[PDB]
Amino acid sequence: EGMWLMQQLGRKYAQMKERGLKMKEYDLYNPNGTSLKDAVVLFDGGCTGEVVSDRGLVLTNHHCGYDMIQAHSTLEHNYLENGFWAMREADELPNKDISVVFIDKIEDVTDYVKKELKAIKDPNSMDYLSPKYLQKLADKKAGKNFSAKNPGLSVEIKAFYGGNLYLMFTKKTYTDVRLVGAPPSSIGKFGADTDNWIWPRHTGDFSIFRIYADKNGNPAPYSEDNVPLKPKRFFNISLGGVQENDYAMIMGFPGTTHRYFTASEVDEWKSIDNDIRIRMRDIRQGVMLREMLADPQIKIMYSAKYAASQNAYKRAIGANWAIKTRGLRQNKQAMQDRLIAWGAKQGTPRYEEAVHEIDATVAKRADLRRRYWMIEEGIIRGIEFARSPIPTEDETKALQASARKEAIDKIRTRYSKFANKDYSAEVDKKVAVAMLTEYLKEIPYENLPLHLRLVKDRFAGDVQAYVDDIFARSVFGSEAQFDAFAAVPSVEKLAEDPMVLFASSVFDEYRKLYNELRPYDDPILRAQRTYIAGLLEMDGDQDQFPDANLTLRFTYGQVKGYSPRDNVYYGHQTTLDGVMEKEDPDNWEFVVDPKLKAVYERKDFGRYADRSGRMPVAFCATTHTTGGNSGSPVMNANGELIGLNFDRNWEGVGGDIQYLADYQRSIIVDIRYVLLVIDKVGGCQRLLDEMNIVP
Amino acid sequence: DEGMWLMQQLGRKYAQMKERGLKMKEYDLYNPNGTSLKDAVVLFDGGCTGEVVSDRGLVLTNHHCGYDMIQAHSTLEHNYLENGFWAMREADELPNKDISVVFIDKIEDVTDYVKKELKAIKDPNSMDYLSPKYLQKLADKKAGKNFSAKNPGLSVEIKAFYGGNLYLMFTKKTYTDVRLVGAPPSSIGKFGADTDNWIWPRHTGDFSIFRIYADKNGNPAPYSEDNVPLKPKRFFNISLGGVQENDYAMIMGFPGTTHRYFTASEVDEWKSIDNDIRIRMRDIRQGVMLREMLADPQIKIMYSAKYAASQNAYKRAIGANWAIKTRGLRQNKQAMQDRLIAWGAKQGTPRYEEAVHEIDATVAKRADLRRRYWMIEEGIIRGIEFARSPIPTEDETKALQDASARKEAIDKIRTRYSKFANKDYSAEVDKKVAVAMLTEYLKEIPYENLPLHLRLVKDRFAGDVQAYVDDIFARSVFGSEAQFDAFAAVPSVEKLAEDPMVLFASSVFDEYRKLYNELRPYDDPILRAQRTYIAGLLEMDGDQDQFPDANLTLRFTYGQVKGYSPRDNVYYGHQTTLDGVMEKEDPDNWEFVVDPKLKAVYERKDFGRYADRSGRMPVAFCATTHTTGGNSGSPVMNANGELIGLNFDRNWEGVGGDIQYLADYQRSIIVDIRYVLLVIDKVGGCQRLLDEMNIVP
Numbered sequence A: 001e002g003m004w005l006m007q008q009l010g011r012k013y014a015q016m017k018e019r020g021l022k023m024k025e026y027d028l029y030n031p032n033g034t035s036l037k038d039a040v041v042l043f044d045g046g047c048t049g050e051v052v053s054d055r056g057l058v059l060t061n062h063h064c065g066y067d068m069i070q071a072h073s074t075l076e077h078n079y080l081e082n083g084f085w086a087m088r089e090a091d092e093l094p095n096k097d098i099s100v101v102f103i104d105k106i107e108d109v110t111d112y113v114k115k116e117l118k119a120i121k122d123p124n125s126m127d128y129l130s131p132k133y134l135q136k137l138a139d140k141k142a143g144k145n146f147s148a149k150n151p152g153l154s155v156e157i158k159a160f161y162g163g164n165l166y167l168m169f170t171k172k173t174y175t176d177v178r179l180v181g182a183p184p185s186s187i188g189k190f191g192a193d194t195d196n197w198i199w200p201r202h203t204g205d206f207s208i209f210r211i212y213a214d215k216n217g218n219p220a221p222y223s224e225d226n227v228p229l230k231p232k233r234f235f236n237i238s239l240g241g242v243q244e245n246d247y248a249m250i251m252g253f254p255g256t257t258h259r260y261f262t263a264s265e266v267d268e269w270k271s272i273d274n275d276i277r278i279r280m281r282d283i284r285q286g287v288m289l290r291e292m293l294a295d296p297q298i299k300i301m302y303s304a305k306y307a308a309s310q311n312a313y314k315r316a317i318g319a320n321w322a323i324k325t326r327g328l329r330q331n332k333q334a335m336q337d338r339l340i341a342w343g344a345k346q347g348t349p350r351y352e353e354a355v356h357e358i359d360a361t362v363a364k365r366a367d368l369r370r371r372y373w374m375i376e377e378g379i380i381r382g383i384e385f386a387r388s389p390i391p392t393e394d395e396t397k398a399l400q401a402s403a404r405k406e407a408i409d410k411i412r413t414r415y416s417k418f419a420n421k422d423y424s425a426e427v428d429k430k431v432a433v434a435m436l437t438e439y440l441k442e443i444p445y446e447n448l449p450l451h452l453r454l455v456k457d458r459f460a461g462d463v464q465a466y467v468d469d470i471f472a473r474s475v476f477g478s479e480a481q482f483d484a485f486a487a488v489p490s491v492e493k494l495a496e497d498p499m500v501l502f503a504s505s506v507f508d509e510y511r512k513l514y515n516e517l518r519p520y521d522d523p524i525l526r527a528q529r530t531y532i533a534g535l536l537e538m539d540g541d542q543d544q545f546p547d548a549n550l551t552l553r554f555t556y557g558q559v560k561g562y563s564p565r566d567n568v569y570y571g572h573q574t575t576l577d578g579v580m581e582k583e584d585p586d587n588w589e590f591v592v593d594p595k596l597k598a599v600y601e602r603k604d605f606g607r608y609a610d611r612s613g614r615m616p617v618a619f620c621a622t623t624h625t626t627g628g629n630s631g632s633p634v635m636n637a638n639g640e641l642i643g644l645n646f647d648r649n650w651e652g653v654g655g656d657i658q659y660l661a662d663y664q665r666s667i668i669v670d671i672r673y674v675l676l677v678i679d680k681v682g683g684c685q686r687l688l689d690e691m692n693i694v695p
Numbered sequence B: 001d002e003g004m005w006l007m008q009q010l011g012r013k014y015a016q017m018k019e020r021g022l023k024m025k026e027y028d029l030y031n032p033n034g035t036s037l038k039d040a041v042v043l044f045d046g047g048c049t050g051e052v053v054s055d056r057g058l059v060l061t062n063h064h065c066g067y068d069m070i071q072a073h074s075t076l077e078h079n080y081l082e083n084g085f086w087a088m089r090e091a092d093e094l095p096n097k098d099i100s101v102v103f104i105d106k107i108e109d110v111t112d113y114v115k116k117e118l119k120a121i122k123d124p125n126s127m128d129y130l131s132p133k134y135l136q137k138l139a140d141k142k143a144g145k146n147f148s149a150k151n152p153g154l155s156v157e158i159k160a161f162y163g164g165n166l167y168l169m170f171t172k173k174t175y176t177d178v179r180l181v182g183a184p185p186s187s188i189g190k191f192g193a194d195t196d197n198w199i200w201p202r203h204t205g206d207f208s209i210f211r212i213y214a215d216k217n218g219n220p221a222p223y224s225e226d227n228v229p230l231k232p233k234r235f236f237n238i239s240l241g242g243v244q245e246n247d248y249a250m251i252m253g254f255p256g257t258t259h260r261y262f263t264a265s266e267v268d269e270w271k272s273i274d275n276d277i278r279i280r281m282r283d284i285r286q287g288v289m290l291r292e293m294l295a296d297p298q299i300k301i302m303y304s305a306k307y308a309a310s311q312n313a314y315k316r317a318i319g320a321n322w323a324i325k326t327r328g329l330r331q332n333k334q335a336m337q338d339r340l341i342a343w344g345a346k347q348g349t350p351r352y353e354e355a356v357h358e359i360d361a362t363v364a365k366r367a368d369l370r371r372r373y374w375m376i377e378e379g380i381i382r383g384i385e386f387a388r389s390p391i392p393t394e395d396e397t398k399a400l401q402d403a404s405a406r407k408e409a410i411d412k413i414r415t416r417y418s419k420f421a422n423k424d425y426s427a428e429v430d431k432k433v434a435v436a437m438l439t440e441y442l443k444e445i446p447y448e449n450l451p452l453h454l455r456l457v458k459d460r461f462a463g464d465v466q467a468y469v470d471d472i473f474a475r476s477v478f479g480s481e482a483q484f485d486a487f488a489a490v491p492s493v494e495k496l497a498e499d500p501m502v503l504f505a506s507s508v509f510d511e512y513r514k515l516y517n518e519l520r521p522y523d524d525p526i527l528r529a530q531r532t533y534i535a536g537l538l539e540m541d542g543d544q545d546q547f548p549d550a551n552l553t554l555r556f557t558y559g560q561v562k563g564y565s566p567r568d569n570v571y572y573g574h575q576t577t578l579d580g581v582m583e584k585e586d587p588d589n590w591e592f593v594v595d596p597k598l599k600a601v602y603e604r605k606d607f608g609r610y611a612d613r614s615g616r617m618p619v620a621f622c623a624t625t626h627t628t629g630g631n632s633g634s635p636v637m638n639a640n641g642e643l644i645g646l647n648f649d650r651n652w653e654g655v656g657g658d659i660q661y662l663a664d665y666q667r668s669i670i671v672d673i674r675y676v677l678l679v680i681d682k683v684g685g686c687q688r689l690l691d692e693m694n695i696v697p
């Protein structure tokens, strides 16, 4: 069930041992010594990674290393398509703007932060959650010259349990992290978007990097003189595999959860956030798909925009399925009713008052939040010409010196970025007519962005005519229309431009709604500090893990499949046969790498196949993970690496609010499949030789 | 692999059936000289199978088998198709016009007799050995002079089996007064609707209830208010014991067709011509149809049934091609024929190898013609609605060329025009479908092989298919109502003779009939070679582990209640439950609406004695029995011969089972009898039907 703080390992250890854990507590996490924790990294600010050799080799997902593989790909050496395998350390490619963060030390600073907070005075101050305020406290505790006296090291204080617990992290950051290896995209992204959030899964989602440092192993930016880091700890690789019911554990950096939502917040998330995202994205995607299917050139131009929209659409469908069928609302209601009864018994009414303040705040912002999601989903992300060029103050106060051409050059650059090779004005007009029709039906005239009032006032309710007019008369409606404006530019033309007025008007409403909604966050936050305080005083920390906040957490469970629906069972493990069943050479998402197909045909699995001679690909576990856990090391009962987490099934996405024991699984790439690909596909033997592989 | 056995083969299979779990005595299941469970099985309405379940002639079959009768009795005031039907007394049971139930009274091996008669050969290539007319003359000769007059209700029929190597005479008893007794609402009877067709897991309560009526002496009689329920020779006891994984299950019914003795070349032909053309052409047609239905709600109403009718055999062809690709159907037929050829070489008899060679040579010879036939049938005959537009008859054209017979010819043509351009026909959708279908057709069929009118695409329209199609509707008398009315006011034979739609339709039907006539002669050499081929297979390996091809005759099949793995890491168990119906509920999709009375039964757990040991309500199960089309409604029996369900479908992964049984994929989809009884009881509230059945604990 939980995403536990490293501090909570002591209190969970006996439960973990009864579940199968065999390694000693301090070998996994030792607060004053080297432990497995020291081999885990926050990879490039989002993902998790792990050190797997005494020469700083790091494993993470392919989707985590995707941008670096793409930045080094050219028509001559397309690493994204064919994979990359540096045959020597000197061939490993440096990456600009990359980082790996080690969690050197973790300290409970709750009493210290709570003493400092007593000097606030204003009771409803938000300094207790301010990164700027907590950084001043962190700096004060570490010293006046900490990062100079301990180079590469930094400190950070974070709030947990709604402001009831504070931890200080001493971090070591390395910025010379080089690309070492990657399978082709056909393996690394096998299912592509079709299999996103899907179990069974057949994707070899991995990529390999190496941390470099100065001669003393201290962090240093890229330099040809940098040498591979010798870490204090690295993971041993297991080739023993997994079996159903085996203990599995993960360490990583889950980003966000909402485990302490009130029942009213679950209803708001369903009826506003999720229903609007689902309704608006289905309209947008439906028009896009029709146009992509009708024109091959439209499919090329809009495939990525279609796939980007679908990702959170699928998440919202999964989340709403949990709200509808797994009693998320009812379970939050029971949680808060239990606290209210306990507070009444003890004579402390502050807990019931805190739940009431959250409910009152949620009910109060309903119309505003609905208007915000409607404009964000319907127009801000729904309509491409909402992000068309808007003349800046310095551009208009230049068009009306001869720096008129400089202003035109800047506006032209933005027009060319809006109307780029992938933009179709015809597809955008079709999407806008469908999206605005829905938007205008849901948002009353008095709440419309000013320009949209012209649909009723000037265009007799004809959305198609209003959209046609924007493109017919706008300087950004076509290249010829822009060039005619650029030849004779006037501020008067820009000020009355229908597309400029649309874009300005919709962004004005979007910012006004955001500014009007921001003040509702703080009362909920303050009430949650009291709410979680009561929940913890009443039941303690055993089932009540702290919400994820991009900090190092551990989770444990077992390798186990699940039943998605009546009479259907998904087992715990997928195989290479499953990749071959999915092969479709005429669908780019399901093309199979010819070298991998030959490995399957000749059964050239070496020591990587399971006892029955079948080649494993992926497995799933009852660990509790979320976004930020991509690339996380998956460990055995002995702490040996058995896989890398890379996804979670859609049926478990509601697990950010309520863990779903019978449906929620972490989707993990089997380490035996990773090694099979490095070996038989990449032929990169030196990477296998530098790892410590246990029989 | 696993089969559809003749009743005559029960003796030789009995010990294998007993070792698999069968407990009933052989002669209680089938006895040629007495009453057996076979006597409770019926051919329901010429296609389906049914079963007698009471001493008062109550019959169970599928909902899709009784669908037309439920629909014929439905009105706006009493919509039985939507709300179900439950006659609360026998006098309320509704008669049905054009219905029948056929009992198989006796079955007799007449092989020796038919082979002696055939020896009077005038032509060694005669097809009389397979002719229904010739075999009927032999059956009439054996049965007696005026047998139907001396035995009213009875009839005699001889059928050929094993390609003409075995003959059985059936004595059939037909009843034509079969009344509608009960039916669940369509939301239960067709729960998955077309979305779940050929699908396992399945949650459909596919059943309907009828009653056979007869005269005072139980003899067949057409509908009469004086008819009384039939007291039958035998009926099924209903089991409430349920099913568990690995339990023995058996079925009796009337499988229609199989191709278990196809050569490897016939498997290749079926894949590369029949299936690939059907798949390619139906995907084009369905793709245009779906796009138009999604864009216009009125088009969705008009084309939904045509879309669903096209999809049914499309899905079957996809499942059949998946089996050819992944289950080694071709290779296994090649091994079967290579084994026979080797054995024939050792026996000193080359006739078996010569027979396989004649089939391969015939298949290779008709390739181009068969390809052209399927291309026109799938691409135009079925693919384009204006191919079935009106064509003036020879007598219609004569009437238009000095009498009042002109107005009669125009009234007949108008009637056909109104049937073509009916409430569900859209000329715009049809023009879009035709442009896509003709584009594919013209790419595959060379100019010299085109129906004459289609040559105008290249010759007159510069290859513009859209312009050719636009012209057909712009200038045709059947292009619009106004265009027809203008023709009907001033009709001339000259106008009809030059009409672009008449010329298109005539031209495509001419090519279709010419291809059919040119292909027909290739059937007989294959048929004659198959008689020798199957004779060799039988002489070599015995009439023991190779079953005769299905031919709409009574067969039995046995297996176990077992699920299967469709793909890597996915397992479908043997049993579905009422919880699965509730998971699928979607009130905004007519296919997945849940009956309010059924939803309340589930919520209250009002399952009575129908739930399984764990308190779960079963809906359907699947078994390793070997079934095909014609087995819908078949009784599914226990090891003791008690009714445990009704067969209603088979999963798409097993459709290749008509050529090669697929032990790890092919399953019969069966509605659990406990679910049938739950629906009769808790939804229909028709207690009298439960009381007349013999329900065993």
Ligand SMILES: Cc1nnc(CN2CCC=C(F)C2)s1
Pocket (backbone or CB within 6 Å): A193, A194, A195, A196, A197, A198, A314, A315, A317, A318, A650
């Ligand atoms: C391709 C597919 N598109 N939808 C599929 C099923 N589910 C629906 C709910 C959420 C998901 F992530 C995926 S498979």
Ligand SMILES: Cc1nnc(CN2CCC=C(F)C2)s1
Pocket (backbone or CB within 6 Å): B194, B195, B196, B197, B198, B199, B315, B316, B318, B319, B652
């Ligand atoms: C609706 C659908 N649900 N499943 C589908 C896939 N298969 C493909 C092969 C044959 C079938 F019968 C159905 S279409």
Ligand SMILES: [Cl-]
Pocket (backbone or CB within 6 Å): A038, A102, A230, A231, A232, A233
């Ligand atoms: Cl380190």
Ligand SMILES: [Cl-]
Pocket (backbone or CB within 6 Å): B348, B349, B350, B351, B352
């Ligand atoms: Cl011979």
Ligand SMILES: [Cl-]
Pocket (backbone or CB within 6 Å): B327, B661, B662, B663, B664, B665
């Ligand atoms: Cl099989």
